[PDB]
């Protein structure tokens, strides 16, 4: 088949394909010896219209898609560079419609060692001449996927435990003097439980906390923002990590305002005002002009606990 | 009567419905509610009664209500206002603006009334940066507070960026002290030149003029170095450069020279630099 040249791509997959579901994979290089992420490109193009009939939702093709990018990392983990392009790409799609879990299904099918590998230098001012604008790129997006991704998963986490707190103690009025007793004991176990689920709460809203100022505060250029300016035309990425920052940066902030709130930290919800206007991010920018007004009731609130308990707006002293 | 009934309540659709129906009563509950300064109209003795503060809301109380009532508008026109009143602390002055900034980007301002609120707060936080920037060697040295404490002027800036206590003062520290000078106000009262002195000045003291095995040791190497970075290139840019040093002064500064006693030392240099400054300009 190798010697004749329609059959170049397919009879290494059928040959290959069969083996892999080692020695084998080694008959397949010598086979391969006797483009990839071009076919992907065009295997997606061909989803995205699919001729005549496309479904409505759906389905699998792009999951299927997810798990050819995995398959591939995996692959390239042991085209690397190409792989974590088109995870990226991936990702994105799944980033716009909140699939959280098939982002990070694709993201852990990326090596963990995917970015140390791809470098063609040590020295990271000769790397940078060396690295394509391609592949920087791809290496600070996959970066600040992992920090949104991060911070969902803590968010979560710090969520689930806030809707956790323990109950109080159960009254029996008229209680006998054996109920009287038991309900003593468990008042007071009750008010050991407490403390621990605010100790575990404060350590799991710091940790929190930390994850969505990495993503609000993105080192080198903000969230979504490319460093490297040379790279060729792709209005198709471009476009979507402007809209990526559209789309989860005023809900980032929106969840932050609210964990700041539910753990009774006013002064610093107000903090979030200089954060947002900030010339030195922007990030006023990424949000709708209601957002915006969303935001200003939201501080107002957190204003309002702040006087009750006897401070001015801002929480400084009277 | 009827007016301090429909406050004492959560009825402000009351007093709404008062004042549909009414000759003069607008006139009247305005001047009713200033002369009840902290006795009827609060928002705060009032716990419906939310809706009924929100009418109450209706001017004074429009800055609690008013951001309840999602008037982002109004709250930018009063977080400024606080924010040019602020005397007392610093790290309130700029989250007041923030927060002001915050509010007019959020409201529903045309793009030509936004455009000119953002640059009209982009001058509060202009002068603001100034403070802002302070050094930290000099904070503590003067034992100041971080947050707790006031801002500077571009006289306390460039006089900070030069003391002898700001150590480690290189090019960078002595061409952002000639960069403060367009900041001033009342240039010929309070000394431009006397300043672009003081500084050229110590600018040669930090550079120390001494002399290694009988022959002269240039020292100058910052001086120099702002003598190189003074000129962007702009022959290229259509600027007059050619000719656009006189800024410095010569027989003027070896009289500061000798109130430091260092004329000896350096003037053996400083006119030697001062001949391939005449050819460089």
Redesign the interface.
Do not use: H, V, W
């Given at each position: 088949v190798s010697h004749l040249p329609q059959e170049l791509a397919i009879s290494q997959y059928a040959v290959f394909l069969e083996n892999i579901t080692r020695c084998l994979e080694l008959a397949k290089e010598a086979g391969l010896d006797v483009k990839t992420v071009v076919e992907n490109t065009r295997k997606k193009d061909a989803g995205e219209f699919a001729h005549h009939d496309f479904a409505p939702a759906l389905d699998s093709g792009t999951s299927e898609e997810d798990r050819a990018k995995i398959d591939v990392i995996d692959w390239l983990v042991f085209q690397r560079a190409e792989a974590l392009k088109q995870s990226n790409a991936i990702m994105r799609k799944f980033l716009a419609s909140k699939k959280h879990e098939a982002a990070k299904e694709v993201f852990a099918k990326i090596p963990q060692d995917s970015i140390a590998e791809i470098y063609s230098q040590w020295e990271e001012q000769a790397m940078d001449s060396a690295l394509p604008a391609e592949d920087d790129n791809a290496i600070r997006e996959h970066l600040c996927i992992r920090a949104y991704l991060e911070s969902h998963e803590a968010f979560n986490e710090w969520f689930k435990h806030i809707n956790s707190p323990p109950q109080k103690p159960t009254l029996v009025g008229q209680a006998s003097f054996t109920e009287k007793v038991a309900h003593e004991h468990k008042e007071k176990k009750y008010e050991m439980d407490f403390g621990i689920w605010k100790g575990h709460l404060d350590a799991l809203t710091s940790d929190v906390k930390e994850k969505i100022y990495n993503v609000l505060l993105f080192v080198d250029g903000g969230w979504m923002v490319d460093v490297r300016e040379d790279t060729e035309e792709d209005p198709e990425r471009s476009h979507q990590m402007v809209l990526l920052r559209r789309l989860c940066l005023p809900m980032m902030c929106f969840l932050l305002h609210t964990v700041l709130h539910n753990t009774k930290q006013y002064k610093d919800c107000l903090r979030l005002a200089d954060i947002v206007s900030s010339e030195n991010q922007k990030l006023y920018t990424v949000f709708s002009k209601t957002e915006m007004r969303n935001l200003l009731q939201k501080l107002r609130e957190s204003s309002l606990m702040l006087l009750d308990l006897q401070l001015d707006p801002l929480g400084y002293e009277i | 009567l009827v007016q301090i009934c429909e406050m004492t309540d959560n009825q402000s659709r009351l007093q709404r419905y008062m004042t549909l129906f009414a000759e003069q009563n607008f006139s009247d509950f305005l001047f009713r509610w200033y002369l009840e300064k902290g006795k009827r109209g609060k928002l705060?003795s009032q716990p419906h009664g939310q809706l009924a503060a929100f009418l109450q809301a209706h001017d004074h109380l429009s800055w609690?209500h008013e951001?309840?009532s999602?008037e982002?508008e109004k709250?930018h026109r009063t977080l400024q206002t606080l924010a040019n009143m602020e005397t007392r602390?610093f790290?309130?002055k700029?989250?007041?603006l923030?927060?002001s900034?915050?509010?007019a980007?959020?409201?529903?301002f045309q793009e030509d009334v936004l455009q000119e609120k953002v640059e009209e707060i982009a001058e509060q936080?202009h002068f603001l940066l100034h403070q802002e920037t302070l050094p930290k060697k000099l904070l503590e040295e003067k034992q100041l507070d971080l947050n707790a404490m006031p801002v500077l002027a571009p006289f306390q800036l460039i006089q900070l960026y030069v003391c002898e206590e700001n150590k480690r003062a290189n090019e960078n520290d002595f061409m952002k002290a000639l960069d403060l000078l367009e900041y001033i106000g009342d240039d010929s009262e309070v000394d431009v030149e006397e300043l672009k002195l003081e500084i050229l000045c110590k600018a040669i003291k930090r550079d120390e003029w001494s002399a290694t095995d009988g022959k002269d040791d240039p020292i100058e190497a910052t001086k120099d170095s702002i003598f190189v970075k003074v000129l962007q290139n702009l022959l290229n840019k259509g600027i007059e450069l050619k000719g656009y040093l006189p800024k410095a002064e010569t027989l003027l500064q070896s009289e500061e020279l000798n109130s430091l006693k260092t004329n000896s030392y350096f003037e053996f240099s400083l006119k030697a630099n001062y001949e391939c400054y005449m050819k460089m300009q």
């Open positions: - | 705060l609690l951001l309840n999602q982002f709250a602390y790290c309130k700029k989250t007041l923030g927060l900034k915050l509010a980007l959020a409201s529903d936080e």
